[PDB]
């Protein structure tokens, strides 16, 4: 049950960067290619920052998929909590590694993307 806490004791930009850094660590430790996540850093930052600030962000979801068939390999959910936390979190990456190899794939043979689960009334954000 991975939780990321946005505590208002910290700035939303710092919290956002720490969330992404914790996700980057998961991607790295799982053996996945980190390039896509780096390319998406600016857009992921904009959406997470904005929807943390409005309170609309509910979960950040890392979706691993098989690019040969485009079917889901596994999902890793990060639940968001708000209070008065720095955004950073740590988990056992074995779950991700295990799911990838269970699909008969090397991590260099899988792809991934971030999904953001929001309250339905949330404002639209450029790029999302
Ligand atoms: Cl925007
Ligand atoms: Ni602090």
From TrEMBL:
<feature type="domain" description="Bacterial HORMA">
    <location>
        <begin position="1"/>
        <end position="128"/>
    </location>
</feature>
<protein>
    <submittedName>
        <fullName>HORMA domain containing protein</fullName>
    </submittedName>
</protein>
């Amino acid at each position: 049950s991975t939780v990321a806490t946005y505590s208002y004791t910290h700035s939303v930009t710092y919290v956002t960067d720490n969330i992404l850094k914790s996700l980057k660590d998961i991607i790295l430790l799982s053996g996945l290619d980190p390039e896509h996540f780096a390319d998406r850093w600016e857009s992921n930052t904009r959406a997470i920052k904005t929807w943390l600030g409005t309170g609309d962000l509910r979960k950040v979801i890392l979706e691993i998929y098989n690019p040969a068939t485009d079917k889901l390999v596994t999902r890793w959910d990060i639940d968001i909590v708000y209070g008065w936390g720095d955004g950073s979190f740590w988990t056992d990456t074995e779950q991700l590694k295990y799911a990838i190899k269970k699909a008969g794939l090397l991590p260099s043979q899988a792809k991934y993307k971030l999904m953001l689960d929001t309250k339905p009334g949330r404002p639209d954000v450029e790029g999302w």
